[PDB]
Each structure stands twice: as C-alpha cells, then as structure tokens.
Paper text:
Carbamoyltransferases (CTases) catalyze carbamoylation, an important modification for the bioactivity of many secondary metabolites with pharmaceutical applications. GdmN and Asm21 contribute to O-carbamoylation at the C7 (S configuration) of geldanamycin and ansamitocins, respectively. CTases in class III, which modify secondary metabolites, adopt two nucleophilic half-reactions, the formation of carbamoyl-AMP derived from ATP, CP, and Mg2+ and the subsequent transfer of the carbamoyl group from carbamoyl-AMP to the secondary metabolites. GdmN forms a face-to-face homodimer through unusual C-terminal domains, a previously unknown functional form for CTases.
Therefore, the co-crystal structures of GdmN/AMP/1 (2.80 Å resolution), GdmN/ATP (2.00 Å resolution), and GdmN/carbamoyl-AMP (1.98 Å resolution) were determined. The electron density clearly revealed that 1, CP, carbamoyl-AMP, and the nucleotides were bound in different substrate-binding sites. In the GdmN/AMP/1, GdmN/ATP, and GdmN/carbamoyl-AMP complexes, the electron density of AMP, ATP, or carbamoyl-AMP only appears in the subdomain of the Kae1-like domain, and these compounds make similar contacts with surrounding residues to those with TobZ. Further experiments indicated that GdmN shares a similar adenylation mechanism with TobZ. Carbamoyl-AMP appears to surround the iron ion binding site, with the amine of the carbamoyl group coordinated to iron ion and the carbonyl oxygen accommodated by the conventional oxyanion hole composed of the backbone amides of R158 and G15732. Subsequently, the docking studies using the GdmN/carbamoyl-AMP complex and 3 suggested that GdmN would be unable to bind 3 in the expected orientation, as we assumed that 3 might have steric interference with loop 2 (D156-H162).
Author numbering:
A (entry chain A): 1 to 675
B (entry chain B): 1 to 679
C-alpha cells in the first residue's frame, strides 16, 4: 500500500494558474509518501523551487518522494488531496471569472495534467481521493503521536467550511465532536493583526517572537472588543463591514498606525503583539478547557497552522488540562497533505498507521553519496577550501567551543519549518552577543528575534522547566521556561521573558546531532547549542549541496560542516568560474515611464522574480547586457567579456544579486542523481 | 457661495496611492462646482486623463471647473467629499497594511497635498466637509428634480454603512426612512453576476443590453435560491463562505460555464443575463411598492449607480406606483461628488438649491473659441480637409438623410455616461443594418444591443409609449416601448422586445441638437436619429478638439461636424507630422523571461498603460527604439529618421497603437487656454 499525499495549488514552474496568483491561494505546497502506514518521504516544494511557502504544484516534491521510496509513479496505489473537490474547484472557478482568458481547467484535470506532463504518469480518476481539510490535519497530527486515543484539535485559517475542528481519535478512527465556523478563525485573526506590524503571510511567528517584549495590558481592553468568551467552550469574534480585516478598523479608530517597512518596532508595536498573543491564548485555552472535561481525554494532539504558535503550545503544556500533548513538525498545510494520504488509504481499505511516535523530521532528499559530494565540492574549489577531518563531529564541537558559527548540513532535510540538526546553523548558546550578531550579521534580521536552543535529552531538565504535561520536544513545538538559575549561563537562547523554544535531541531522534551537542557540553560544561535554520533572509531552508554552499558563501558563517567535510571560503574567491542560470521565475526588464513634458523618461533596468510578493532590484546597464546573454552553460567570467571583463564593481553587483537569489550561480555541471 | 464637490481616490497622474490600486477603490473620480446653489460646472476625471471610470484624484477636473466659473482656487468657500472621513481613512489604512512601504497619508492630508501641489491652493482644514455617501447621492438626485418633495431611493454597491437608503425630501431637507445593509447590495449582486459573463466593472450596461435576448425562465429558480422577498419591503440575499461572489458558487454547482474572452454569447449566457435582470427588477419593485404605500408619496427620485439600469427605470415608470420619476444624468459616484457639495453647503451655512429641473448635462469644458478651433484644425491640415458651410446643421441633416454616419461635437461635454448631442455619433435610425455597420465603424462588439434613439419633444409620443408616470427623458434614463406600428420603421434603435432607451430633446434641453433632429425629420419624415457616444472601444467620451479629431481619424466615421466645421480625412493622411507624447501612465518595456535550460529566454518589446486593467501591446524592435526617443516635441516623422524613415509598415504599427491610445499623437503645440467666450 503506497499512497501519495498532495497539497497546494496547480501552477507550473514559470507561470501561475492565473497571473500573479495571490500567495495565500493554497500555499505551502508539498508531497508526502506513505507505505504500509509509515511516512517514508516528505518534502515541501519551497525547498526545491526556492520560493518560500510556494503555491506552485509540488511536482519536484513528488519526484523526490518517489526516488526516496525507490518507487515508480505506476507503483502508487492512491493519491490524496487535502481539500474537497467542490471547494477547490469553486475557488478556481472564482479566479476564472476574474480572469476571463484563463481556460476552465478544474483541479482533477490540472492534477492529472501536471502528473502526466511532469512525471509521465497517467493517474486514473479512481485513484484520486479528495479529503476534508481538517480531517487531513487530524490524521497527520494523531497518527504520528504514538497514542491510541486522544482529543484532536485542529485550528487553522480555514478548511472548506470551518476554521476549527475537534475530534475524538481511537485506534485509527476519528469521530468529529465539534467545529467552529470560518468567521471565527483564529488563524485569520492572527494574520489580520500581523498586517498591522508591517508584516505579511508567513510572518506570524515573528509577531510571536515580538510579543514577550511587549506589555499585554496596553491594548487588552481594545482586543476585548473583538472577541467574547461564551459558556460551554464557545466564543465569538466581532467582525465589521468596513474592510476585510477584523483588527485594523478598531485600532485605527484608537489612533494605532500600522508599522511601515524598514521602520523600528516601537513599544506600541510590541504591546500590540503581546495583547494579540494573549488574546489567542485566552481563546484556545477556553476551547481546550471545555473539550478536555467534556470529551474526557487526558491526551491532546494539536494541529493546523495555529499549532505552530510555540508560545501557545507551551501554555497548553503548563495548563494542567492534559497529561500528554503531541504536535507534528509540519502542522501547517504541508502536514494536511500527508494526512490526505492516510485518509485516501482509509477510503480504499483498512488504514495502516505508524508503529511509533515520530521522533525525526529528517524526511526530505539527502545531499548525496560521499563520492558525488566530494566530486561536487571539487567543482567549487575556486571558491572554497575543504578539509577532511578524521572526526568531523569532534572537530565541529571544538570549533563551536572556540566561538565559531557553523553551518551544519547532514542527510535528509527537515519536513516542516524548524531546523533540527540536518540543515542548521549552530553556535555557542552562552554569550548574549551571539544573539545580537547572528541576528544582525548572519541571518540579517530584526534585533528582537529570539534564538532557539538544542539540549541533550539527558541534560534537558538541568536547564529547562518541562513540568506539567509530557510534551514532545523533538521538533521545537513548545516554548518552555529556562530555569532561573540557568538564564545568565544561556545568554543567547533565553528570551526576554525567560523562555526558550527548546529542541530536546536524543540518540534516537538525531544520533549525530546529539553527539555534537553532548561533546560540546563535555568540552564546555554546557550541553546546549543555539540552533537556527540554515537559510538567509531570501530563501527557505537550504536543500541541495549547491544550496548549502551558496548559502554558506553568501552569509557570514565561519565554517561549513557538510557530510563530514569542513568547508571555508577562500580568501579571494573566483566568482568568474560560476555559471549563471535563470530561475523559472527570473525576469529582466528595461523600462521607461513618462518623463518631463510628456517625454519618454530615462531608461532604468531591473531584475525581478515573477510571483506574487516576489522581490525586485535595480541593475546597471552593464549587468543588464551581461545577464541578457545568460545561456546556462557559459561562465560569468566569459559572459562578462562582452561588457569589458568581470570588473570588481561588476563582480560585487552580481554577488549582491546572488545573495538575494535573483538567479542561480553555481559551478558548471551538477551533482547528478542522488545516490 | 462657491462650493466644490469631490469624489474618487487620491492617486497622482503617473502612479497610484498603492501599486495597481484596484479599479473599484473609489472610481469615477470627478469634480463639480456649485455657486449660490446652482451647478455651474461638472466633469469626470476620465474625460481629462482618458482612463475610463478612473480612480485617480480629479485634479484636472477641479482645474477645469474653476476655469469655467472664472474662479481662483482661493475663491472656493468649501469642499465636500462624498464619504465620511473615518470610512475612507479606514479603507486607506487597510490598503496601507497590505502595502507596508506606502507612507501613511490619510484623506485630509492627501486632498490638501494634491490641491497644494497641483493648484498652489492651501486648503484650510475648516473648509473641508465629509459627507455620508448616500446623502450625497440623494441631494444630487433630488435637488435637480424640480420637485417640491419626493420619495428618494438610493441603490448602489455600497456607501459607508449601507447598500441602499430611502429618504423623504421636502424643500431642502432630507429625512432618512430606511436603509439596507452592505451584504444585501444589488449593485454588488449585479456586478458579481456580470463577471460570469466574461465582463467586469463598468460592463453592467452591456449585460442589461443582453438580457432581452434571453429567456428568464431558465435560471429563474436558480436565482430564487439567492434571494428571498420578505414582509415590509425587506429582502435577503443568501451569501456563502466559499468565495467573495454571491452568484458563482451556485451556478458553478449547476454546470454553468463563465464565458471566456473572445467567446460568443451562448443561449445559456443570454438566459443568465435575462434572469439576473429579472431578479433585480423584482427586488427593487418590492422595495418601491412598500415605500410608495408607506410614505404615501406620488413622486420618486432614484439615484446611486443602480439607477443607470434604464430597463429597471422603465419598469418603475410603467408600474402604477408613482406619478413622477426623476433620474439624474450622473447617478453614479460622479453625482455623489456633486451632492457632496450641496451637503457641505448645508453643513457650513445655508443650502441654496437649483431654480429649475435639470434639462441639460452639457457641463464640462467646451471645445474652445471659434478662432482657436480654426487655428487648431489648421495644425491638423496634413491629415484632414475642412469645410465651413453656411449652416452646418442644415448640411449635417442632409448628409444624415443621405446615409452618412457623423461625429457631432459641440460646446460643453456631457456629465455622466450618456452622450446627448455634445459628444455624439449620429445616424439615420431607420436601417437595421446600421447596428452592425456602426459597431464596426467604432470597433465595438455590441451588435446585440440596439443604439439609442433621440427624438424631438414634439414627435416623441408619435413613436414611443411614454405612458404611466411622467419621467424625465432628457438623459436616456428610461427604457420605453416603441409603438408597434413604428417598430419596423425604427430598425436601428428597437430592441428584440420592442423597447428603446429614448432621449427626448427639446429646444430647452439642447437647442442645436433639437434643430438637427427636427430638420432631419422634415427631410425624411422620421424625426428620430440614432445617438451613441463619441468614443472608440479604448477611451471614454472625447473631451477636447484634439480628442475629437483623434477619435474621428482612428474610426471609420464618414464625416465630423465640430462647432460648424465639416471635417473629413484626407486620402493618405500624413501621420509623420504628429508629435508623440507619453501619457503619464505610458510604459515602454524590453523584457526577458526565463528560457529552456535556465537560459535568459524570450526577448520581447511592449507598451502598456500602468493602471489596474490597463491595456498592453507588443511592439517591434524598431518601434521600441523610436518610442524610446520620444521627447514631447519632435514629430513622429523626424523621430522615425533615426530608424530609417517612417515606412508604411512603421506607420501602420504606430496607427494601431494610436487606435488603442497607448500614447498621445497630435500636431505640435496645443489649442491653448480655452477662450473666455463671454458666457
Ligand atoms: N488551511 C489553512 O488556513 O492553512 P494552514 O493550516 O497552513 O494555517 C494557516 C493559518 O495558520 C495561521 N498561523 C500560522 N502561524 C501562526 C501562529 N504562530 N500563531 C497563530 N496563527 C498562526 C496563519 O495565520 C494562517 O491563518
Ligand atoms: N458607491 C458605489 O458603489 O458606486 P456607484 O454609486 O457609482 O454604483 C456602482 C454600482 O452600480 C452598479 N451598477 C452600475 N450599473 C448598473 C446596472 N446597469 N445595473 C445594475 N447595477 C449597476 C455597479 O455594479 C456597482 O455595484
Ligand atoms: Fe490548514
Ligand atoms: Fe455610490
């Protein structure tokens, strides 16, 4: 029994189903593969097309999943899609009314067209199963918990008819207990409010990181006008008729002004964040307090995109409402895609479930075999120096103890948004200055942002307060208190409120990463590391060896540990040997607007990425000419001869575009099919 | 007391307040000027920036209105804006949360900035008055009716808080009797349905033209699921949580297929339009039957954008409910901008009202003085031949009797969407072939709609069943039956159900145009003309002389009558003497997309108009190089020297871009400041 789970929209690599398809129209595309009830492979399409939270059809992810399972398309017994057919088709039909040139292709036709054109796979109609959206979430969250009965709560922005659903799970059967309508959405509430802070879709966890810097009393009575807690686990959100945003009109009337890009986060902004976070904590705990005592369950599985609110989860853990809580590493819609595989399997026969609680999210493609990795690192030789230590883990522990910030890339990539020891950036957790600098210089992000620690399972209760319910900490699902007597020791990873979104690593969840942290603790006395995701501000978590090396070279990391090779940047790297390539969404434009006296204005030149919310940057006339000659095979140095050789100012301009990922720059060739 | 009324959004000429600001965010921008209670000038900004139903700040409209009144900006005593300040600022604030780079500028500061920078006018805060949206509508509709009191109904998409409002008006006082909430919007219902027909905002009038071709029984029971009529003039529209469109989910579930671009209308499409039109009629007559009985009033004024549904108006007229009905020529948001001026006057002092019922919509800028008009037509000489007949009207009527299709441009442009004898295209109303013929001449694809007839007041009741109430017909507000015995005679202007959107012209409403239609009737025996707006498919109604000549030269009209001059195009017009100028929204682009094997891919050259819904067209590498050299003064022929001369192929390419109005092409210089004609 081999079953594919699918989620996302249906756009091709280089175009969208309608032009500029909004970024929230079926986002976080992914593919998962289950075999005999076990999750054998899963990867988000963002890792492969390099578009964060992409809506494009997860073609590459399907291909990578099949290869990891050693399967052909013809081996797949069924395909589950994470929404009902009538809902996604009605939304497609709506887009087609707004875009009268788009042909009327609905989801079944588009899914089959993508699989046939992109994988040579003719999917028969009877093998495609559409699934209620919150049922898909619930299966994914519950079946990986290792529990044999539980309360299951799903809270997201919306499914087809509901923003929240409550289930009883027993054995492999789900029984719906209750639901909450779409206008009561807590995901929608959090996203509406996120927009007041100059942020957008995907930035909610940044708002969450901002909340502890604020005082929730300032705007508590304002948010109190937007919701009412009612008897027996009910609540209401109070909408308005002015604009499609629950939050902005009231806050505007009280004189709150939305933050602008590039402007500081004021104390009013921080206080706004703190009151928002308190509001959805109050509502969710109200829901759970009622359904815990009503359902009788002592164990909770929590899923849906709202379950990535690590602060909320930590509060649930400390609430005393449950004995055990489980949260999946991919509780957003990528996890619903996996749940749609289990639901499709259930619709066609008995359902097989995982045998054990999931401990590792290392489920994506790996980096390659040892031979091809070493060969590809040799292609990068004009840029990097490579060393092959006898014991890379021992060597990396020492570099960390000496204050180096390390890129760390091993085996299969993490499913879901957290880095957990396979595509990580790691540093000494003790100095508070590491937080200041890794925010400012490495990740190039806001100074208020916290950093998450990883601790060995054996030392976890020496540093963190895990009391209350038994939660699963393998995936940084829970914010927990750092013990007061350890807060000054753990300066880089203790948040302003004394908490940490902790990863507890064990020999079973991540043997190699556990050894790294254990050895570091033997050398320093502190078995705790800072662990942030391996990506710059312009990209999702790195996937391939080329992604890893590109990110290392365009961030300010000290050294890269990749499959036991230590990589350092050459003193003077030769950018000239790199072969530029367009991404499928890369565009180059020479533009004139109107000028004075209704003339044609002066020409300007720009590169941009062609998707909703994609970046753009001005380029010089010289680089515009250079980039127009890109062929995918010719090196940057040779291309540059048509404009008088790779200038130092030209190399610098190209390097800035590379850092922003407007194009692909990498040595000729590629690593080949992954061994 | 000189009061300016404003409506629309706040964008400058060349950018929008947020990029690609949606075409529905405070559209049909306009400026109106009232003086001691009289409307002295009004024009929609679309006529001046040439963007249909534009949302941009009506700066040109304000400048033109002040010039017509002989006023400085500093002479204005108050400015009224057609929405409450908190509502428009909350919408702007919402736009600013979606675009975090936009500076936080709200409506008061933006109004003051545009007026300061555009006119040197420092508007004091106390002179700016913000007005309830449906109140602005009601004042404009009622104060121009000539009525001593009336029931006043406003239906549109939405105001700040309602989609419909009912008032009793008396003297200059308005008293609100009822309202209907935003989600019950009939303007919203109609526009939602319009999208299923492959159309968009501003195409509702086309859907209404299509409805008579359809059988309303096909989808009657489907639409019945979307509304319920209730007691006491109430009704409900049944929404859905699937998508922000009331109509598409249920029709999708029943197998309906939204029409695609360039696809012809199926019978299903025709029937859909017919059931939609029936639906809105049933609901509006349900509202009006209750409020006529409850108010006891025998007179109705009807405004808001829904009041441009002239088939509905015609059915209101034929209902037994009222003795008089009045509809303003600009019942859409441009007229709310007017009504905001009245409300501001009532607020900050006493409200003076118009002396008489409005008979003419000739209220925008004129074409110019007789001498600058002849001076300017001389600049066009390499393209046209001009005659100066003794009596242009007499000549025009003869040409019309011979079968010619004329452009007709006189005086001040019409306020509101209908051409009424000042920016019109006129032809014999009798030949049914003229429908297909004239649609081809202006390159429009609305052969399924008949054109609208204009008739003299004296003959009106010889041709049209005006019975029922007394409606005002000076603005084509009512669809009325064409008398059976006259239907085959009026072949170009009679619809498949026997109806027509009639303009009745009188010596009082438009002296010149009345004389023209009268004279034509003396020569032919039929004192009825076809009258359609003077614009091709790519522009609003022409405004200036240059607009008029440009439109004449880019359509296949036989002859142009403009201010007593007879204009015809030369055989072989010399396009090279035209000076190209970018419009503020013109963009010229060379583009590379991604190619196979991750190469830099297909290279293309394009021109487009940078606004939501703006057109675009491919251009050749040679024309790209020529257009990039446009300086606003050098002629097309001289610019073309830099790429080898103006070849027949290049001139053909440019002409097609001219037809689509991607740039301005006209002789060097301009007509100069419009002459103070002494009126
Ligand atoms: N079907 C569907 O809606 O997709 P989905 O399961 O992937 O969840 C997305 C929703 O989670 C909300 N969300 C994401 N992170 C969140 C956070 N830290 N706190 C609250 N809500 C959050 C987000 O704002 C958005 O409303
Ligand atoms: N504030 C505000 O909403 O603007 P507004 O007063 O200018 O009216 C616009 C509304 O009239 C509706 N509308 C326009 N023409 C229409 C027609 N022939 N039939 C029905 N509705 C129409 C149109 O679909 C739109 O919903
Ligand atoms: Fe979801
Ligand atoms: Fe309106």
């Amino acid at each position: 029994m081999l079953v594919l789970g699918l989620n996302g929209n249906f756009s091709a690599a280089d175009t969208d189903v309608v032009p500029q398809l909004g970024e929230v129209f079926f986002h976080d595309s992914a593919a998962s593969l289950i075999r005999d009830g076990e999750l054998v492979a899963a990867v988000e399409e963002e890792r492969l097309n390099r578009i964060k939270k992409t809506t494009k059809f997860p073609l590459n992810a399907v291909r990578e999943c099949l290869a990891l399972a050693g399967a052909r398309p013809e081996d797949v017994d069924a395909v589950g899609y994470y929404f009902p057919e009538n809902h996604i088709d009605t939304v497609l039909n709506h887009l087609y009314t707004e875009y009268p040139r788009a042909p009327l292709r609905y989801s079944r036709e588009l899914i089959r067209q993508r699989l046939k054109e992109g994988l040579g796979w003719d999917l028969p109609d009877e093998k495609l199963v559409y699934v209620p959206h919150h049922e898909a979430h619930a299966y994914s969250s519950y079946l990986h918990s290792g529990m044999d009965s539980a309360l299951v709560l799903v809270l997201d922005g919306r499914g087809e008819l509901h923003s929240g659903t409550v289930y009883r799970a027993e054995g492999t059967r789900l029984e719906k207990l209750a639901d909450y309508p779409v206008p009561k959405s807590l995901g929608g509430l959090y996203l509406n409010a996120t927009y007041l802070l100059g942020y957008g879709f995907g930035d909610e966890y940044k708002v969450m990181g901002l909340a502890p810097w604020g005082n929730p009393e300032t705007y508590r009575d304002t948010f109190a006008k937007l919701y009412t807690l009612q008897d027996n686990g009910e609540y209401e959100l109070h909408g308005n008729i002015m604009v499609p945003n629950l939050v902005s009109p009231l806050f505007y009337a009280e004189g709150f002004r939305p933050r602008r890009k590039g402007e500081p986060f004021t104390q009013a902004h921080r206080d706004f964040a703190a009151a928002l976070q308190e509001t959805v904590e109050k509502i969710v705990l109200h829901i759970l307090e009622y359904w815990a005592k009503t359902s009788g369950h002592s164990r909770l599985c929590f899923g849906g995109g709202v379950a990535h609110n690590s602060s909320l989860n930590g509060l649930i853990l400390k609430s005393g409402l449950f004995d055990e809580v489980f949260v999946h590493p991919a509780s957003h819609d990528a996890g619903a895609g996996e749940g749609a595989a289990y639901a499709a399997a259930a619709s066609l026969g008995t359902l097989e479930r995982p045998g054990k609680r999931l401990l590792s999210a290392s489920l994506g493609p790996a980096l390659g075999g040892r031979e091809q990795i070493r060969a590809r690192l040799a292609d990068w030789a004009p840029l990097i120096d490579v060393e092959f230590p006898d014991d890379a883990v021992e060597t990396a522990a020492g570099l960390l103890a000496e204050g180096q910030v390390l890129g760390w890339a091993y085996g299969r990539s993490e499913f879901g948004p957290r880095a957990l020891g396979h595509r990580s950036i790691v540093a000494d957790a003790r100095p508070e200055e590491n937080r200041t600098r890794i925010n400012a210089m490495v990740k190039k992000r806001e100074g208020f942002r916290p950093f998450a620690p990883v601790v060995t399972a054996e030392a976890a209760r020496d540093y963190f307060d895990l009391s209350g319910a038994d939660g699963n900490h393998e995936f940084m699902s829970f914010v927990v208190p750092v013990l007061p007597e350890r807060r000054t020791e753990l300066g880089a990873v203790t948040h302003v409120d004394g908490t940490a979104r902790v990863q507890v690593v064990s020999a079973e969840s991540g043997e190699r990463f556990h050894r790294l942290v254990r050895r570091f603790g033997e050398l320093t006395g502190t078995p705790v590391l800072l662990n942030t995701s391996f990506n710059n501000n312009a990209e999702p978590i790195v996937q391939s060896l080329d992604d890893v090396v590109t990110s290392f070279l365009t961030t300010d990391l000290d050294v890269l540990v990749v499959e036991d090779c230590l990589v350092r940047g050459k003193a003077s790297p030769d950018l000239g040997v790199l072969v530029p390539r367009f991404r499928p969404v890369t565009r180059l434009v020479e533009r004139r607007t109107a000028g004075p006296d209704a003339s044609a204005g002066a020409k300007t030149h720009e590169i941009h990425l062609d998707y909703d919310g994609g970046p753009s940057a001005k380029v010089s006339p010289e680089l515009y000419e250079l980039l127009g000659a890109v062929d995918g095979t010719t090196t940057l140095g040779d291309l540059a001869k048509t404009v008088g050789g790779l200038s130092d100012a030209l190399a610098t301009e190209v390097f800035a575009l590379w850092e922003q990922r407007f194009l692909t720059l990498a040595p000729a060739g590629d690593i080949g099919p992954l061994a």
